[PDB]
Ligand binder design. Structure first.
Ligand SMILES: O=c1[nH]c(=O)c2nn[nH]c2[nH]1
Ligand SMILES: O=c1[nH]c(=O)c2nn[nH]c2[nH]1
Ligand SMILES: O=c1[nH]c(=O)c2nn[nH]c2[nH]1
Ligand SMILES: O=c1[nH]c(=O)c2nn[nH]c2[nH]1
Ligand code: NA
Ligand code: NA
Ligand code: NA
Ligand code: NA
Lengths: 295, 295, 295, 295
């Protein structure tokens, strides 16, 4: 037998950082969960019990904290690139670092219509994420995403004209509820190294904001023919607005809300045009994916 | 042996309702999870296998949907009171109904600075809840709450002057992070029945809003001497603003963020006044409770 | 306003302890999650910012570890009583301690039909729990429980003869699936203090084992007329086998498995006597409770 | 823009099946969660709102139930292959089916030392899984796995001789706790189609059993030099015992249990050779992966 692939590191490293403006008194907080996995010439730790090649996962944890102390943690695309580059440059025998960052929301509170200098609220479990792969001699590959964005529209969704055969019971509809949890990922063109990532720093927050705005507006305004058709519209617009993105991937559950026939009870009308009360279904759920790239 | 207490019913009943304004085209959605448990002369179902006394839990589920079809579902204090009253009036041998409702957020989307007529976002997992106990001959007892309100302040929290003995290692501090998940419950004076609950309908949403506002403002503005002292201030203000509330209960975890000493690494300074990077602790957590009533 | 009730302490304290037999080489592990909440003359910490009355929650955490170092941690009824007694005896102004312990399974591995001296498996998320309330001048109240015991029987469950009215759609049945997650609690007679708890030490593990065995056997062997009837049989037997128990409480969800009518597809028969494939329902679920005591 | 990749289907489809032996009265239950995602000539559903190419996800759900009615559901490798093959053969324009199955434990109860004919217990959240990819003209690729197998050993784990530099604080150790949740996957050689999968049916359950046994025995008996070294031993043995496996992949968290220094309290000794009470850490955790193949 032989080692075909190996990677190891530290997962679930929670990190908080505060920035204090001494001039204005305003404080800003960042909180993330970080995972770093390394690859390189480490096979002998598996095959020969040779620990001399192992950068201890405990040390990886220390390094994350030290790196956060000495560098900006925002945008996360930059922080992840700094962190990954550190490992491949510091250790001769480590040739790839894989950094995953989940950013948690701490949104500044408004108290009496004024932004508070040091108080924050977690407004939703929506996350902003990055996956950064730093590979020696091959540059930096960055995938940015948003996830956990949960939305619902109560009308202006349709689904008709699908294949019907002996396995089909679903009725065609011209008016249904559409609800989903959005997972959207945009993949950047490969960067040659840290200098190039630094040169594009302003684009990272701006593209996240654009991706979010396009997702929300398109969902709200599209008279949707299907999840497939609406998601493609979203992806098309993101690609049009940021030339440095190569592909956009969406993964959308279709979270079903079923009509409840109440006609058995005193002829109560609660279906079709008379539908008011519905039963949200926890499972199963449709799952629709697509990756859109350039012609 | 004898049955000392018994209750049974249906839990985890998910319900969605939409309201459509035909005049304006505006739609409003409500989504809840409902539990209804009944008590009464039902001992023989346990002791003698006498099912004749059992209103099937499946029927309880049907009743929830039918009641939602025929009545407003907001405020939840009213809906819960209607639902509970139904069971004690309809069934001679049922003498108490216990209704728990969890309301999920569906907040109308703003698209281009305009409220959208039929599109919604789940902005946070914060819930508004009610517990309604309807007891034949004893009226209606309502406890309203908010839960899952997660906040953090990065300064203006202190904790010093606590008991020190041979079990104590905690250092006194004049500047720390304070973060919690707020669970706040206000208990209404007993109501004589549905007519009285109806007479107070406007107070329910207004008191929820007040409870939320007082919680947020007090948390943000108090130079906190302890979780205990800050929570008492919150409760005092709610009681002062709504005379129909008898007690206010808060249950607050203290979600700890620890300093990280980095001095072992090149004398890096990251403690006390130099603290920038902290480690959020998943567990353990302080848990502080209090119930405040009138003199 | 006035403080009507207050309690505070530390939750989610994870503790592991190992016992090493030097003679045999055999090691035994225990892992628990502990919560301790205190009450007493602590109102001024809430109302006057007087921290002098506060035993810091951090110190409570230290005390749990120290107590586990110096005492047996099994049975949990004994450990909880030792821990609670400590606080009321050590601190003049603390008058009640409330200790909750969740015990996690680490079951010794069998390797080649022989018990291994130091290797363990988590066989299920079933827990054994205790709630111990130690109140100065009022003794020690102990509630022991098992929870998270998930079972299913595929036949020998019935449900017919229930109330039918205009809210009823459920069909009577003489053969259904019954599945539940068992939560069973037995409440001990009040103990005068630690000496009395110590005198009954052997009864704690034996009664847990009896409660588990009675639950499993009764579930498997009863031709069940309802969840209500089967659960009462369980409780009756536990009370008969341990005179020091005052009450037994069961709380059982009814986790529904629905028939799937496939007749629309080529006349496929999958209902009643021909039912083979079913759809487990995640929600809603029946919830049935009862507390059984002595005549 | 262009569609680069697309797949869609139904996730979280819960399925239960019962087998009844009329001769012996013995019943056996199977419960799974199934996901099926399809690929093929479906781009126009995204780009042109052409639903004519869509097999509705609702129909996919129906098909899962019908297939379970008409075929054995065990071993899951066979069921998944039948299910995936159905879609590529039935629909001209569907060219790949991706089937994921999670099998839940329902272990027959022993009552009074005798196996019960129709009563079952969920003994642990350990799962047996399959991923089956059926691709038209390219055969059937099957990855089998076990996951959620949680184990701990209290001694006979070491970790010393790792890289030490200015980022290192971890002390070398010759005696520590080792605990993990095992995720192990074995990848079968490509199969030409359903006939070939059928020909190897007995190997599926036998190889799962071998993988489990090798994992448990090796964990218990290895005087572990590191997670890396122990996991490689496991993988090597599985490959040696089943020639039809091409690769074995393990992914293991290192779930840390920390010593607690209690020396500050009355010189209490709880470190090194005197360590009895430890603090399980919820996060962070080491994460170690490896894929082992043939020379
Ligand atoms: O078994 C281990 N492997 C590792 O790579 C490691 N790093 N810290 N502790 C460790 N333990
Ligand atoms: O065992 C049951 N008890 C009940 O109260 C009930 N209601 N519906 N189905 C039921 N099954
Ligand atoms: O606000 C606090 N209250 C407490 O009771 C406590 N105990 N430790 N830290 C604490 N912080
Ligand atoms: O938008 C949808 N897309 C689909 O593929 C589908 N299948 N059933 N319902 C559906 N809705
Ligand atoms: Na390198
Ligand atoms: Na009544
Ligand atoms: Na006392
Ligand atoms: Na095909």
């Amino acid at each position: 037998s032989a080692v075909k692939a190996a990677r190891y590191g530290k997962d679930n490293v929670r990190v908080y950082k505060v920035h204090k403006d001494e001039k204005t008194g305003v404080q800003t907080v960042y909180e993330m969960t970080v995972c770093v996995l390394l690859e390189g010439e480490i096979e002998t730790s598996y095959t020969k019990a040779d620990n001399s090649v192992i950068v201890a996962t405990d040390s990886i944890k220390n390094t994350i904290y030290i790196t956060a102390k000495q560098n900006p943690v925002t945008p996360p695309e930059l922080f992840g690139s700094i962190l990954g580059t550190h490992f491949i440059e510091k250790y001769n025998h480590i040739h790839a670092a894989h950094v995953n960052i989940v950013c948690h929301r701490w949104t500044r509170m408004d108290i009496d219509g004024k932004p508070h200098p040091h108080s924050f609220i977690r407004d939703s479990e929506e996350k902003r994420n990055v996956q950064v792969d730093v590979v020696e001699g091959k540059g930096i590959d960055i995938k940015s995403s948003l996830s956990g964005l949960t939305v619902l529209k109560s009308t202006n969704s349709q689904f008709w004209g699908f294949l019907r055969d002996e396995y089909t019971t679903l009725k065609e509809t011209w008016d249904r509820i559409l609800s989903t949890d959005v997972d959207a990922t945009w993949q950047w063109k490969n960067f040659s190294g840290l200098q190039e990532v630094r040169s594009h720093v302003p684009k990272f927050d701006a593209t996240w904001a654009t991706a979010r705005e396009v997702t929300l507006k398109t969902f709200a305004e599209d008279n949707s023919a299907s999840v497939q058709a609406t998601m493609y519209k979203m992806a098309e617009q993101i690609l049009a607005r940021q030339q440095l993105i190569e592909t956009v991937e969406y993964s959308l559950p279709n979270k079903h809300y079923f009509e409840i026939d109440l006609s058995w009870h005193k002829g109560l009308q609660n279906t079709g045009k008379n539908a008011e009360v519905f039963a949200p279904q926890s499972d199963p759920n449709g799952l629709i994916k697509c990756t859109v790239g350039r012609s």
